[PDB]
Symmetry: C2
Subunit: 397 residues, 2 copies
């Protein structure tokens, strides 16, 4: 029969990849979001992917006319009315644990509201906003320093997994539904947060200001900015100024210290740029003193360069190792899927210093991954006729 | 030593009454709120009470100068700075379970935020807003149809009890303190709710609209008003309009039915006036059909007249009994402390029908209570020379 995937980002791409891999006799169609103009970013363009993989792209209007189909929305942008289809085989993933957090900005509102957990829900599409009956859902805790970005990436991951787990049952029709409860049902509109005039209310407690700071931390979109300083995390102090909330107690290149309703807060200026630059050639000790939060070690720039990617490209071995010891993925990738091993290969080639590879292989470096173009490090070295290096790399298990 | 009670309402009055009763060698002073102009309302005027009981009223500025004193704030309206006293014996009751819900409108915000519980906290005054170290606190659950009024009255009650329980330890100095945690500390300002332009957001779920309706239900101040109809409670329906949230599906004299993000809602128009009038002379059956929520049976007008008070004054015996069966207090009082028994005495006198008293005594009618002037039903009948009726009433245990 036919399966129409309507949506965006790594959820739509990874679900579709799984279907291609796993489900043979299934005719795939794509419906893409209006603002998907084919550019990969922190998330892949589903439009680009579909064009490359010969998945036909159709309009939402075309989708209404397809009979013997199942329709699955994955972060789709247009309202879907069940009355416009011949069938009821119309499914959505919504990034919350429904019935809570229907609607918008689900990576922010749970954090703003100091929730202990969130989740992802697979449900039927009905006429209204995230209102249809629940087919499956999974919960997870929010971390103490969860940000909207870290939360969104959880969503992408769990939602991909829920879709894969349930898809055979969606296809067969062998699934159960439960109507959403009215109790603890909640919704937020597009008007609920104005991302283009974002204000942190400083006439609040230390905890409430830091929850806001974190709920608004999503580098690709923005960082919170206070007193003309971009902020990347902070901490609650033990001191309690008598000054009114919002008073700036201290401002320098490193941080802002503010008085609040209760405890003073220290808000760390963003120094990610300086952290990436340090990873070229500075020691772990140097970097450990530059950073004000270890969360900065996991950040990525617009290309997806992380600290480890910089350290690998530059052959900064002590930094690579130290990053791995702080829980950084030795097989990290940029936004094109290009891996640590590929960046390190370039350093090997440029430098002629092949001595560090074994160390990294022993830390779990994977030479066999492929980038978004489907090429491994081996494919590149072959294409470029770098046979000595290809052969040296090939000796490792 | 000296004890200064700074504040308002039945909490300040009842605490002070307990002290007068229980603590002999204690010199009392009062500081009253700027807007306490001596008028009893749903709460007693502490100013009136102090003048009548010869408790000297002093300014806050006078209070700073009293040495060998303890200072206790009970819903006081002016900021207290610990630096202005010779001593640290400065205590506050705050109507929340701190560190949550510092600041304003604590009868509303927990309801708006769908909390499962609230509480009351006794703590030291420090320079900031409800920030000082905790001496004691008690928690309680919020009812499913809790309103800001029912919540406030809980607060008054539990806070009076916490003060009475802890006062000897405050006086002796033999109490423990714990600093408030930063975690889960929250605050709301006067700006957080505009009671003079109160808007219910109807682009929300059924549950969220009803939480707002209830958080804004406090008859003495206001009822929520939608489409020019005063609302007193409502219910979530099983129907789900396709129309956009806020669409009025039905409007008549009884109710408004609205479409929401999820389930339709029925909002009951306020008919308290009609309920009081019915209690004069109509049957329980009649009233049971007039009411749309049994919460209406417990409501009071600006004098403190409840349904039972009306039924008693009018000798509506079946209604009195039926009210008691619905959990109404047979010893209910108006805002001057005047009891059901007093109102029923007037009906006895007016009518010459003494036959129903025994029935009420058997349901728990208390002839021995005193009003805010310190007079019982017996005192009134003696003053008015109604000796036959006095003597008839006197035969009951
Ligand atoms: C637009 C925007 C978003 N964010 C955060 C908050 C948001 O939850 C997360 C992902 O943003 P996104 O996918 O635009 O939008 P959102 O989570 O509201 O998703 C909503 O719109 C999409 C198209 C619907 O399918 C979805 N079901 C909705 O929840 O990033 C920001 O931090 N800054 C922004 O400017
Ligand atoms: C991390 C890093 C990269 N570069 C260069 C090297 C790279 O070709 C160019 C753009 O980076 P990119 O978009 O992350 O590279 P891409 O995903 O196109 O991958 C390419 O370059 C890498 C180095 C090869 O191993 C890989 N086989 C190529 O496809 O920037 C730098 O100059 N400095 C750096 O720190
Ligand atoms: C003014 C106002 C209040 N309310 C509700 C909400 C509020 O929590 C409750 C009692 O009102 P109130 O005592 O004026 O004020 P509130 O609870 O903000 O108390 C605040 O101000 C007093 C003076 C401080 O001592 C206290 N600690 C504060 O919490 O009634 C309404 O429903 N409508 C109103 O217009
Ligand atoms: C409940 C009720 C009362 N009344 C009258 C009777 C009352 O004197 C007057 C004002 O009511 P109130 O302020 O509640 O009365 P108050 O607290 O001053 O008490 C007085 O009147 C009552 C009836 C006596 O038993 C009591 N001993 C008096 O002090 O209104 C009515 O006309 N209709 C009523 O339904
Ligand atoms: N029936 C249905 N319900 C949904 O919740 C839903 C779908 N379909 N399809 C995909 C996506 C679409 N979500 C939306 C949500 C709002 C608008 C919209 O145009 N809203 C108004 C009001 C804005 C607001 O309040 O957010 C607008 O003027 O923009 C469009 C698509 N979505 C589930 O993810
Ligand atoms: N140190 C101290 N802290 C308190 O929280 C407190 C006291 N004392 N004393 C009694 C009462 C007084 N509460 C208040 C709170 C705000 C304003 C005030 O004037 N606020 C500003 C801003 C308004 C707002 O944000 O609420 C104003 O302009 O009105 C006055 C008294 N109160 C605890 O109950
Ligand atoms: Cl190469
Ligand atoms: Cl009398
Ligand atoms: K402060
Ligand atoms: K609706
Ligand atoms: Na993209
Ligand atoms: Na199911
Ligand atoms: Na917005
Ligand atoms: Na702006
Ligand atoms: Na550091
Ligand atoms: Na009063
Ligand atoms: Na204690
Ligand atoms: Na206000
Ligand atoms: Na108004
Ligand atoms: Na009824």
């Amino acid at each position: 029969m036919k399966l129409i995937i309507a949506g965006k980002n790594n959820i739509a791409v990874d679900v579709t990849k799984w279907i291609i891999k796993t489900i043979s006799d299934i005719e795939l169609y794509s419906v893409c979001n209006e603002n998907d103009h084919g550019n990969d970013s922190f998330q892949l363009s589903f439009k680009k992917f579909c064009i490359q993989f010969n998945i036909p792209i159709i309009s939402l209007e075309d989708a209404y006319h397809l009979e013997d189909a199942i329709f699955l929305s994955l972060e789709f942008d247009k309202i879907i009315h069940p009355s416009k289809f011949t069938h009821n085989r119309i499914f959505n993933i919504h990034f919350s644990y429904l019935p809570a957090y229907k609607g918008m900005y689900t990576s922010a509102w749970p954090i703003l509201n100091n929730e202990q957990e969130s989740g992802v829900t697979l449900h039927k599409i009905d006429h209204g906003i995230d209102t249809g009956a629940i087919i499956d859902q999974q919960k997870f805790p929010l971390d103490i320093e969860e940000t909207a970005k870290t939360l969104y990436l959880k969503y992408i991951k769990i939602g991909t997994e829920i879709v894969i787990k349930n898809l055979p049952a969606l296809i067969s029709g062998n699934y159960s539904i439960v109507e959403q409860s009215a109790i603890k049902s909640s919704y937020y509109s597009k008007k609920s947060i104005d991302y283009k005039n974002l204000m942190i209310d400083l006439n609040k407690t230390a905890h409430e200001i830091l929850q806001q700071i974190r709920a608004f931390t999503f580098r690709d979109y923005q960082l919170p900015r206070i007193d003309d300083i971009d902020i990347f995390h902070g901490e609650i102090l033990s001191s309690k100024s008598l000054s009114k909330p919002g008073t700036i107690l201290e401002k320098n290149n490193y941080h802002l210290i503010l008085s609040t309703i209760d405890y003073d807060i220290k808000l760390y200026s963003d120094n990610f740029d300086e952290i990436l630059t340090a990873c070229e050639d500075k020691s772990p000790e140097f970097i450990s003193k530059l950073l004000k939060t270890e969360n900065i070690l996991f950040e990525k720039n617009h290309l997806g360069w992380s600290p480890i990617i910089i350290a690998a490209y530059h052959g900064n071995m002590d930094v690579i190792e130290w990053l791995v010891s702080k829980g950084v993925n030795i097989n990290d990738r940029n936004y094109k899927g290009t891996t640590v091993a590929m960046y390190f290969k370039d350093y090997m080639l440029r430098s002629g210093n092949y001595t560090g590879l074994e160390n990294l292989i022993n830390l779990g470096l994977d030479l066999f991954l492929k980038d978004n173009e489907g090429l491994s490090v081996f494919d590149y070295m072959r294409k470029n006729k770098n046979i000595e290096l290809f052969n040296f790399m090939s000796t490792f298990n």
